[PDB]
């Protein structure tokens, strides 16, 4: 806690820096995000897999704010703390630094929360931050921010009466006592399903993301892609299954059919997209639906498989966003028909595009492949029909992926030259992490 407060105060020192010394401004802004990465590394070195299912427990008196660490939260924290410095490497204004610092603080605080009211309070404290981020004056879209903010607020407002009702029912808001009291599982279950089906892109209420993640700049795009959807999955795992199992069971056909139709329609809709950024936007929907079905399956190893898939997407998809952002910034447009002959023009960049495309398509020597194998193992053990439905449409995503890749990469050379040292460095952590987790993730 003390260390965390020290980082919190140290990050705020950015505003106190006079703008005259830009060099030190960049150094301080980057280092402030560097530190938590090492801190989470130190935590992982401190964790015990032979110890309790929860470790490093701390409570701030009667102020709720229960913080504890499982494997899922620690892994998500590690992935986020890897992602954020790259986002910092793509910003040029102090306001962006402050917004992303607050966003990272909120994400980290929510990632290890153990109070449902605490999760409610801490999660959506960044909604105004996203609103200011997405609808920036020169290049953003106000409509996308309006959409996403309204969707999130609708979810939270639906959830809140359920949260306070179970609080009054059990007299507290701690998960480890909420999980131990009898409760009216149904109402809280509807609240949780609504919120985490809005957060994770699930049909029908998922339409904010395609506009939002495209209107946002590169850093915010990577943040939204790799973080806030996983807040939904960790939300399920940490709260809904431990608290209300009967609702989870009675809704399982509904959740499964909704996830399946979401995956199918998103996969089919993607082929008709005409912009690379929108193509990348629809890509994440199938992954999130697969994660949700894997979580809801609970067959053999569902939590671990879901965590693996969440890590895999938060690793690979930001690379797609990095390539998209580089191409747009050094091209001033995102429209596909202006992309051609990229391999001869951007050899290393196009090679990375190929590699991360394969990563999206679940191919061996990549963490996504093992992730989807484990998720389909969990799904299959529940039933084989759902596993077949996931297996049958594997071709349909790779269809649009390969079509877009070949269309923009091969052909007549026209456009930007290859990537720069900064861009290759930004690409680097995702490549190394994906290789490491696709060769020997465990030991």
């Amino acid at each position: 806690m003390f260390i965390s407060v020290l980082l919190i105060l140290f990050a705020l020192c950015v505003t106190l820096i006079p703008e005259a010394h830009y060099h030190m401004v960049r150094v301080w802004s980057f280092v402030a995000t560097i530190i938590p990465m090492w801190v989470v590394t130190w935590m992982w070195w401190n964790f015990d897999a032979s110890g309790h299912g929860l470790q490093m427990l701390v409570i701030l008196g009667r102020s709720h704010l229960a913080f504890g660490i499982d494997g899922v939260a620690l892994s998500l924290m590690l992935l986020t703390t890897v992602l954020f410095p790259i986002c910092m490497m793509l910003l040029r204004t102090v306001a962006g630094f402050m917004t992303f610092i607050l966003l990272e603080v909120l994400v980290l605080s929510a990632l290890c929360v153990l109070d449902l009211l605490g999760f409610y309070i801490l999660f959506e404290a960044s909604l105004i931050l996203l609103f200011l981020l997405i609808g920036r004056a020169p290049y953003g879209s106000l409509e996308a921010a309006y959409k996403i903010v309204l969707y999130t607020m609708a979810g939270s407002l639906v959830l809140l009466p359920t949260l306070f009702m179970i609080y009054s029912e059990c007299g507290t808001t701690n998960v480890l006592y909420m999980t131990c009291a009898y409760n009216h599982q149904t109402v809280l279950g509807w609240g949780l399903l609504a919120v985490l089906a809005v957060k994770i892109p699930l049909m029908p209420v998922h339409l904010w993301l395609p506009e939002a993640h495209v209107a946002a700049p590169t850093a915010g795009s990577v943040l939204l892609a790799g973080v806030l959807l996983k807040l939904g999955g960790i939300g399920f795992l940490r709260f809904m299954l431990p608290v209300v199992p009967e609702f989870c069971v009675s809704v399982f056909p509904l959740v499964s059919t909704l996830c399946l139709v979401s995956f199918l329609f998103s996969t089919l809709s993607t082929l008709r997209q005409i912009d690379l950024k929108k193509i990348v936007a629809y890509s994440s929907i199938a992954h999130m639906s697969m994660v949700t079905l894997a979580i809801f399956s609970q067959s053999e190893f569902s939590a671990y498989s879901s965590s693996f898939l969440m890590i895999a997407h938060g690793l690979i998809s930001p690379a797609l966003f990095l390539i998209v952002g580089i191409l747009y910034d050094r091209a001033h447009t995102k429209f596909i028909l202006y992309f051609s002959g990229l391999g001869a023009s951007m050899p290393i960049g196009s090679t990375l595009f190929f590699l991360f495309t394969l990563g999206n398509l679940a191919f061996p020597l990549f963490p996504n492949f093992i992730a989807e194998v484990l998720c389909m193992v969990s799904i299959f053990a529940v039933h084989e029909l759902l596993a077949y439905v996931f297996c049958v449409c594997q071709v349909l995503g790779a269809a649009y992926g390969f079509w877009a890749f070949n269309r923009v990469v091969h052909g007549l050379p026209r456009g930007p030259a290859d990537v720069t040292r900064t861009e290759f460095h930004t690409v680097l952590p995702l490549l190394i992490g994906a290789v490491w987790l696709g060769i020997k993730p465990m030991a």
């Binding site: 015990d48 032979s50 110890g51 309790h52 299912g53 480890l176 006592y177 999980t179 131990c180 009898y182």
Partner: protein, 75 residues
């Protein structure tokens, strides 16, 4: 009865409050679960977590046994 269950809950809280061990023994890895006559075992959270950890240990032991028997079958 209500008073019987109140007394049992108080005794369980007492027992778990004063509980410890040494010689490199990792707690939450106990050798035995505690037998009980309690409907909906979640009525006593301490016993619930004890049994949870025991069940986890047993599951991972089953996995290890599966690996060993797979090796012997391959041989």
């Amino acid at each position: 009865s209500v008073e019987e269950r109140q007394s049992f809950h108080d005794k369980v809280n007492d027992v778990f409050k004063n509980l410890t061990g040494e010689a490199g023994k990792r707690w939450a890895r106990p050798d035995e679960p505690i037998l009980h006559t309690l409907n909906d075992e979640k009525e006593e959270p301490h016993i619930f977590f004890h049994n949870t950890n025991y069940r986890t240990s047993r599951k991972y032991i089953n996995v290890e046994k599966t690996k060993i028997l797979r090796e012997q079958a391959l041989e």
